[PDB]
Amino acid sequence: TEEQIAEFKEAFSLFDKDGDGTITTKELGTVMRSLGQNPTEAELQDMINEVDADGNGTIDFPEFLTMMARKMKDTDSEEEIREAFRVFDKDGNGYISAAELRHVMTNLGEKLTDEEVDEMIREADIDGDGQVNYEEFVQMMTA
Amino acid sequence: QLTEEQIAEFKEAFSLFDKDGDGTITTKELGTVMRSLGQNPTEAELQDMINEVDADGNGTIDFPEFLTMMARKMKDTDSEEEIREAFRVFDKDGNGYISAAELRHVMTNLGEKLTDEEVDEMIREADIDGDGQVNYEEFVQMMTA
Amino acid sequence: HHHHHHGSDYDDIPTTSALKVQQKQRQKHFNRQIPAAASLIQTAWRCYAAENPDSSTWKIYIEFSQLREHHRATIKVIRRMQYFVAKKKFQQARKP
Amino acid sequence: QQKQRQKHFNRQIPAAASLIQTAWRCYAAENPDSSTWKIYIEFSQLREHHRATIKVIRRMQYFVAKKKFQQARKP
Ligand SMILES: [Ca+2]
Ligand SMILES: [Ca+2]
Ligand SMILES: [Ca+2]
Ligand SMILES: [Ca+2]
Ligand SMILES: [K+]
Ligand SMILES: [K+]
Ligand SMILES: [K+]
Ligand SMILES: [K+]
C-alpha cells in the first residue's frame, strides 16, 4: 500500500546517511552505536549478508523492501520458534518452568532485561503451578 | 508532601531550564527551552511566566522558588470554582451544560488554540452526551481528582 | 482659603450620557473575560493530560513526535534483521 | 563420535535462546508502550526530560492564565 511504501522509504533513509542509495556496514554500525549498542564488525557483516541478495556487500532499497516483506508468520516461521523451545524442554512436555524461561532468556544470547522478561511471563498469562505453555507463547507471537 | 524521589525529580527539572548551571532561570533560558520545543513565545509571555514564579522580584527563578510553584495545590476549593466559572462564561443557557460544538469552538479557536486531536480526547474522555451536551461540572471534577 | 460659613440651603438646578460610557465599559469588561476563561480551561486540561504518558497532547510537539517515529522505525528494522540472522544461524546448528 | 554430537548440541543452545529473543523483540516492538523501549537509555531519558520540561511549562502557563482570569473578573 501507498502508506507502507512511504514508510519503508523513510526507514531506508534513516540508515543511508550519505544518501547514495545504499546501506554500508559502518552506516548500520553508526545507527546501532547511536542507539546505545556496540556490535562487532562480524555482527554487522552478518546482518548485511542476510539482506544483501546481489552479493555486493551493501543493501539497496529493493533488497531492503524484500526483507521488510518477508513473512514472519504462519505455516512455518512458527516451528523454529516452536522448536526454539526444544533445547530447554527437559521433560518432553510442551511446558517450561517460569524460573527456567527467565534464566535462558536473561542469561543467554541477546540477554534481555528483567523488565522485558517480566513482560514476557505476564503476557503469557498461562501457568498452572509452575509450568509455561510455550506453544501458546508461539501462537501469541505469530498472530 | 515531599519525598526523596520527588525532590530528586524537581532538581533534575530545574537543571533542564538552567542550562548555565548558575542556580537561576532567566527569561532567555525559559525561552530557549520553549523554542526548542517547537514554540515561539513573546518576550512579554516569558517574563509573565517568570514573574508568576519569581517571589523575591529579582526577575529570575531560583530552586526554592521553583519548588514552591511545583508544590502549589491545583485541586479543591479555590482552584475548582475558578475553572467552573471559566466555563460559566461560555454557558449561555444557565443550565450547567454546553454543546459539544461550542466546546470544540472555544477550545480550538480561542486562547492557546489547542489541536483537534486534543479536543477529540476531551470529548471522548468526557463520555457525556445527552443528545449533544457536555456536563462541564464533572469535567472540572475529572481534572481535579 | 477663607471660611465657608455654612451653606445657604438654596434650592435650584442651573446647568446640565454617562449611561452610554459605562455600558461600553461593561461590554468591554466582559469582552476581556472570553479569552481569559478559555485560556484557563485549556491550560488546566493540558496540565491534566500531561500526567498521561500516552494521550494525543504529546503529538503537538512535531520534531519530537517525529523523532520517536524515526526511533521506533530504525529499531523495528534492526530487530527484524537480527531475527533473520538468528533464524538462519540457528538451524545451521541443526543441520548434521 | 560422542564428543562430535555433544559439541553440535552445545552450539544449539545459544542459537536456541537467541531465536526466541529476537522473535519476541520483534513482537514487543509493535507495542508503542511496553518495557522493551526502556532498554534504550539515552532516548528513554530524553523522553523523561521532554515530558518534564513540558509539565513544568504547562503549569507555569496555568497559573499565568489563572491569575489573568482572576484579574479579568474583578469588577
Ligand atoms: Ca550509504
Ligand atoms: Ca546489494
Ligand atoms: Ca541561568
Ligand atoms: Ca527569584
Ligand atoms: K538511544
Ligand atoms: K520538540
Ligand atoms: K519510543
Ligand atoms: K514523549
Curated annotation (Swiss-Prot), chain A:
Record entry for activity regulation: (Microbial infection) Inactivated by S.flexneri OspC1 and OspC3 proteins, which specifically bind the apo-form of calmodulin, thereby preventing calcium-binding and activity.
Residue numbers bearing the Phosphothreonine modification: T40, T106
Residue list for modification N6,N6,N6-trimethyllysine: K111
Any one Gene Ontology BP term: negative regulation of high voltage-gated calcium channel activity
PTM: Ubiquitination results in a strongly decreased activity.
Annotated GO CC locations: calcium channel complex; calyx of Held; catalytic complex; centrosome; cytoplasm; cytosol; extracellular region; myelin sheath
Binding locations of Ca(2+) 2: D52, D54, N56, T58, E63
SUPFAM superfamilies: EF-hand (SSF47473)
Domain EF-hand: 3-38, 39-74, 76-111, 112-143
Subcellular location: Cytoplasm, Cytoskeleton, Spindle; Cytoplasm, Cytoskeleton, Spindle pole; Cytoplasm, Cytoskeleton, Microtubule organizing center, Centrosome; Cell projection, Cilium, Flagellum
Residues with Phosphotyrosine modification: Y95, Y134
Effect of E136V: In LQT14; loss-of-function variant causing impaired negative regulation of high voltage-gated calcium channel activity; impaired regulation of cardiac muscle cell action potential; decreased calcium ion binding
Chain positions found as N6-methyllysine: K111
Binding, Ca(2+) 3: D89, D91, N93, Y95, E100
PROSITE patterns for the chain: EF_HAND_1 (PS00018), EF_HAND_2 (PS50222)
Keyword NADP: no
Binding site for Ca(2+) 1: D16, D18, D20, T22, E27
Entry keyword set: Acetylation, Calcium, Cell projection, Cilium, Cytoplasm, Cytoskeleton, Disease variant, Flagellum, Host-virus interaction, Isopeptide bond, Long QT syndrome, Metal-binding, Methylation, Phosphoprotein, Repeat, Ubl conjugation
Binding locations of Ca(2+) 4: D125, D127, D129, Q131, E136
Sites of the Glycyl lysine isopeptide (Lys-Gly) (interchain with G-Cter in ubiquitin) crosslink: K17
Record comment regarding domains: The N-terminal and C-terminal lobes of CALM bind to the C-terminus of KCNQ1 in a clamp-like conformation. Binding of CALM C-terminus to KCNQ1 is calcium-independent but is essential for assembly of the structure. Binding of CALM N-terminus to KCNQ1 is calcium-dependent and regulates electrophysiological activity of the channel. The C-lobe interacts with KCNN4 channels in a calcium-independent manner, whereas the N-lobe interacts with the S4-S5 linker of KCNN4 in a calcium-dependent manner playing a role as calcium sensor and gating the channel.
Record's miscellaneous remark: This protein has four functional calcium-binding sites.
UniProt name for this protein: Calmodulin-1
Organism annotation: Homo sapiens (Human)
Species classification: Eukaryota, Metazoa, Chordata, Craniata, Vertebrata
Protein's gene: CALM1
Swiss-Prot record, chain C:
Effect the entry attributes to changing R32W: In LQT1; decreased potassium channel activity; no effect on CALM binding in the presence of calcium; decreased CALM binding in the absence of calcium
Record note on what altering R79P does: In LQT1; uncertain significance
Impact after mutating N31H: In LQT1; uncertain significance
Region described as Interaction with CALM: 36-48, 76-90
Post-translational modification as stated in the protein's UniProt record: Ubiquitinated by NEDD4L; promotes internalization. The ubiquitinylated form is internalized through a clathrin-mediated endocytosis by interacting with AP2M1 and is recycled back to the cell membrane via RAB4A and RAB11A. Deubiquitinated by USP2; counteracts the NEDD4L-specific down-regulation of I(Ks) and restores the membrane localization.
Mutation effect (W45G): In LQT1; uncertain significance
Localization (cell): Cell membrane; Cytoplasmic vesicle membrane; Early endosome; Membrane raft
Resulting phenotype, R26G: In LQT1; loss of channel activity
Effect of M81R: In LQT1; uncertain significance
Assigned protein family: Belongs to the potassium channel family. KQT (TC 1.A.1.15) subfamily. Kv7.1/KCNQ1 sub-subfamily.
Subunit note: Tetramer. Heterotetramer with KCNE1; targets to the membrane raft. Interacts (via C-terminus) with calmodulin; forms a heterooctameric structure (with 4:4 KCNQ1:CALM stoichiometry); the interaction is calcium-independent, constitutive, participates in the proper assembly of a functional channel and also acts a calcium sensor. KCNQ1 channels interact more strongly with Ca(2+)-CALM than with apoCALM.
Record text about domains: Each channel subunit contains six transmembrane segments (S1-S6) with S1-S4 forming one voltage sensing domain (VSD) and S5-S6 contributing to form one quarter of an interlocking pore-forming domain (PD). The segment S6 is involved in the inhibition of voltage-gated potassium channel activity by KCNE4.
Disease per record: Long QT syndrome 1: A heart disorder characterized by a prolonged QT interval on the ECG and polymorphic ventricular arrhythmias. They cause syncope and sudden death in response to exercise or emotional stress, and can present with a sentinel event of sudden cardiac death in infancy. Jervell and Lange-Nielsen syndrome 1: An autosomal recessive disorder characterized by congenital deafness, prolongation of the QT interval, syncopal attacks due to ventricular arrhythmias, and a high risk of sudden death.
Name the UniProt record assigns to this protein: Potassium voltage-gated channel subfamily KQT member 1
